[PDB]
Amino acid sequence: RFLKVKNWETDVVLTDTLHLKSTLETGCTEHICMGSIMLPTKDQLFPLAKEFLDQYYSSIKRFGSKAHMDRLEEVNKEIESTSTYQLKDTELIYGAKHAWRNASRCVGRIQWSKLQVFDARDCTTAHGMFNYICNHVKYATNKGNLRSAITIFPQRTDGKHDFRVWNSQLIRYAGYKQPDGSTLGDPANVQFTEICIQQGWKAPRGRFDVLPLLLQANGNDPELFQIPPELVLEVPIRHPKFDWFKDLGLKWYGLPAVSNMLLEIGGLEFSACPFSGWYMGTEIGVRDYCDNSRYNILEEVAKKMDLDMRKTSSLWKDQALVEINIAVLYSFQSDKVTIVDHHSATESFIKHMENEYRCRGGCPADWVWIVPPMSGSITPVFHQEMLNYRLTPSFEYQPDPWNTHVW
Amino acid sequence: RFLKVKNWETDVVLTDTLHLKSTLETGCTEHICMGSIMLPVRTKDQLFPLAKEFLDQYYSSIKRFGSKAHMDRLEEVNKEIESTSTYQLKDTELIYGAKHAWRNASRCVGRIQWSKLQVFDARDCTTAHGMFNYICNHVKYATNKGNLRSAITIFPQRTDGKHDFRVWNSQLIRYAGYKQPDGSTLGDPANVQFTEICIQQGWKAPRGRFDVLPLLLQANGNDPELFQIPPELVLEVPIRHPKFDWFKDLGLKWYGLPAVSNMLLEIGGLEFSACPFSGWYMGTEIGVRDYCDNSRYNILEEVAKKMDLDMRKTSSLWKDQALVEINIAVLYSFQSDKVTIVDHHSATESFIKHMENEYRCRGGCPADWVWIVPPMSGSITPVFHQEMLNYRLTPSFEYQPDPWNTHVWKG
Ligand code: HEM
Ligand code: HEM
Ligand SMILES: C[C@H](O)[C@H](O)[C@H]1CNc2nc(N)[nH]c(=O)c2N1
Ligand SMILES: C[C@H](O)[C@H](O)[C@H]1CNc2nc(N)[nH]c(=O)c2N1
Ligand SMILES: CCCSCC(=N)NCCC[C@H](N)C(=O)O
Ligand SMILES: CCCSCC(=N)NCCC[C@H](N)C(=O)O
Ligand SMILES: [Zn+2]
């Protein structure tokens, strides 16, 4: 019931008690681990509300206070009468910060308490949503000195009036299937791009076309908006030693902003809640650039480097991988756009993990996601045992809207 | 039930039914995943079911399930258990069991080779000297002048738990580690404790950076005894780099034969506490872990210094650059000397093929992603993108406590 985690590099042992406050289910059983699987009423709502308000009042050191009992009473009446309830600004801010604190797949959580929360619960239309999003984009980007932020649209009601951002991230590049047979641009975005085209987007059909936003308000049909080009900060990719690198014609955007997830606070569901921080280098240089089903550039780069590509054991892929990642970090730093390398990021996460163990009794962490996709064992998180469990408030996956939405 | 796994690079979806034959537990619950945790005498009563399920599997594999020979074997084992409290495997069952323990080993990326395993039956062994002889023969057979062959040597099973055979070494061949008075370590820091034990037992330590440890061997529950593997049987590879001529002057070498010796083999409820097995290296085990862990030889700094990388900031990726070069050197060196080794691209690609074949013909392939994914360049290997299901099938290889913690010293 009390659990130990060991670091095998340092021999440091930490004791986890926080997992006992765990609510949601993992996908694992006593018989089968699913650790590497990507996706494994009024009566219902009040326990969820109480659970949350209890942790909220405990955090401000007012547990069992009159003001605690009063709010619990208030929320109870509101659920009974209206079948839902509304969070106070304080509770919303606390909830959003804690959903991030609880994000077991996020290596950047040392930052969790420094989060700007934009309350967009007064939004009613897709145009309103677009305005809120541009303001988020501009605030967070901050001329390259990035600041974490989340923008929170109205909560789910009867589930027929959902707010959704149809994009998976606020800023992404289009993907196009070619007559040739190949894919132009980002192969991850082919289906979304087609939906944009079908809804009327005039596609430039280039390699790096910033997708339009497809915004859904109050369960209405989604609408298209183009983010002002001047608000989308992009970085051309060059290498500090290879002058040919720029000739590859590569660039990426500065703002990673996940827009397809669901924020659950006190049993309330925020289906539209785009949030953003800043990139760890490997996200672009390893995953976006080198996944075979993404921009898949390893071969071209290796060729420019004149590596022996005849045999896997020359480690030509590995050599080119390192260089691509050097070029990403270098280009972002030169243009003064916040980026973190995987050594620095994982080192900070270990410090955060120890902070969380001593101050909270644990830190839920998904090792499979936390360990960077290159140089795993030369980062300290590789050697760190982690326990994975689900705490609430949380960010949840949700089905893509085009499968749910009735037009 | 059916469980599906997806490869996110290829969209290939596989269906697992094999997990339904799993009996042992994982450490995980519906409330907590322990998938990154390193380590998460029976009765007649419990023994016969274990024997029976094993012999049912064995007899199905040979297409003789429910045969008279199958039924007679069950009766024979049942009577042996009732009468003696244990039973003896036939040589065929032992070979099958050992092959299956490997097939079922969810942390092993090399399992495409599972059916090609030389099994040495050492169940007639009675003394540490006898053990030493068996182990020398295994080393020589497996090494095969660099053309490595998978092998396992199987010593007598546990009886009352007071007469265990154990190899005290974690691997048959490993380098000594010595803690210095100034707190630095000479040699391999992983083996400091075991090295101290050896010295205490009377080993004369050379006290160098790459001293092959003596074997410490326990037979029949007796105090363990020291033996030096004949040096001529210990194949080693000096490490050099194909383009960097200074790499040789780091003084690095490694041994060719990885032979895990501290695990327990379970077959049909029987426990083989001494069962060293060996295959061949995947390059990263040496060039990433053994050389570049901070708690091991930790050579990253010295290599990057010699390469004149910018070491002032992590974001130059100097550690990553040196890491690749070190790993090129390990593969280059083994290949040049004609010692079997496999790179992490080849190994993982072979594992994916094995895994798909296993799904098709066996209904599953239990796999531990945390262990299967190599410790460098994770996502440019296909396994990173492969969803896996981890569960425990028998026969199996298990961890067991280090024997110096549990041994009752006789004197
Ligand atoms: C401040 C800098 C941040 C860094 C360096 C960072 C780092 C990361 C990384 C590397 C991932 C894995 C992404 C992937 O492989 O696709 C991740 C995932 C995640 N992060 Fe963070 N993050 C940051 C900010 C944030 C913020 C502000 C939030 C919420 C307010 C957040 C919540 C999450 C969640 C829910 C995931 C999992 C997303 C998914 O499952 O696809 N992160 N983070
Ligand atoms: C034939 C070539 C083989 C290759 C390339 C290979 C590859 C590997 C690698 C890279 C590991 C992880 C090692 C570590 O990180 O410490 C491993 C683990 C393992 N292998 Fe294999 N292996 C091979 C043969 C074998 C054989 C012959 C057996 C048994 C008959 C076996 C059983 C196991 C087991 C039980 C583990 C987990 C060990 C542990 O938990 O420490 N392997 N294998
Ligand atoms: C199958 C496996 O779970 C999948 O490839 C995961 C592995 N780890 C990951 N880790 C991060 N951070 N992001 C990812 O997309 C993935 N993909
Ligand atoms: C904490 C973590 O489970 C531990 O470092 C594991 C991770 N994956 C591994 N994978 C392999 N193949 N070998 C190892 O020793 C480890 N160590
Ligand atoms: C967006 C806020 C959540 S964490 C921020 C982040 N650093 N990455 C997020 C996911 C981006 C994706 N991996 C990509 O490489 O585009
Ligand atoms: C021994 C047979 C089981 S798997 C074979 C193997 N390829 N490696 C085994 C473990 C070696 C360790 N990683 C080392 O670097 O010495
Ligand atoms: Zn699990």
Swiss-Prot record, chain B:
Domain of life assignment: Eukaryota
Tissue specificity of this protein: Isoform N-NOS-1 is expressed in brain and colorectum. Found in the Auerbach's plexus of the enteric nervous system. Isoform PNNOS is expressed in the penis, urethra, prostate, and skeletal muscle, and coexists with the cerebellar nnos in the pelvic plexus, bladder and liver, and is detectable in the cerebellum.
Residues noted as binding L-arginine in the record, renumbered to the chain: 171, 280-281, 285
Entry binding sites for (6R)-L-erythro-5,6,7,8-tetrahydrobiopterin: 36, 370-371, 384
Subcellular location: Cell membrane, Sarcolemma; Cell projection, Dendritic spine
Listed GO biological process terms: arginine catabolic process; behavioral response to cocaine; calcium ion transport; cellular response to epinephrine stimulus; cellular response to growth factor stimulus; cellular response to mechanical stimulus; establishment of localization in cell; establishment of protein localization
UniProt GO MF annotations: ATPase binding; cadmium ion binding; calcium-dependent protein binding; calmodulin binding; enzyme binding; flavin adenine dinucleotide binding; FMN binding; heme binding
An annotated GO cellular component: azurophil granule
Consequence recorded when altering residue 281 to H: 50% decrease of nitric-oxide synthase activity
Binding site for heme b: 108, 399
Keywords per UniProt: Calmodulin-binding, Cell membrane, Cell projection, FAD, Flavoprotein, FMN, Heme, Iron, Membrane, Metal-binding, NADP, Oxidoreductase, Phosphoprotein, Synapse, Ubl conjugation
PTM note: Ubiquitinated; mediated by STUB1/CHIP in the presence of Hsp70 and Hsp40 (in vitro).
Domain notes: The PDZ domain participates in protein-protein interaction, and is responsible for targeting nNos to synaptic membranes. Mediates interaction with VAC14.
Physiological role: Produces nitric oxide (NO) which is a messenger molecule with diverse functions throughout the body. In the brain and peripheral nervous system, NO displays many properties of a neurotransmitter. Inhibitory transmitter for non-adrenergic and non-cholinergic nerves in the colorectum. Probably has nitrosylase activity and mediates cysteine S-nitrosylation of cytoplasmic target proteins such SRR. Inhibitory transmitter for non-adrenergic and non-cholinergic nerves in the colorectum.
Annotated family: Belongs to the NOS family.
Subunit comment: Homodimer. Interacts with DLG4 (via N-terminal tandem pair of PDZ domains); the interaction possibly being prevented by the association between NOS1 and CAPON. Forms a ternary complex with CAPON and RASD1. Forms a ternary complex with CAPON and SYN1. Interacts with ZDHHC23. Interacts with NOSIP; which may impair its synaptic location. Interacts with HTR4. Interacts with SLC6A4. Interacts with VAC14.
Name by which UniProt lists this protein: Nitric oxide synthase 1
Residue window of the full protein shown: 299 to 718 of 1429
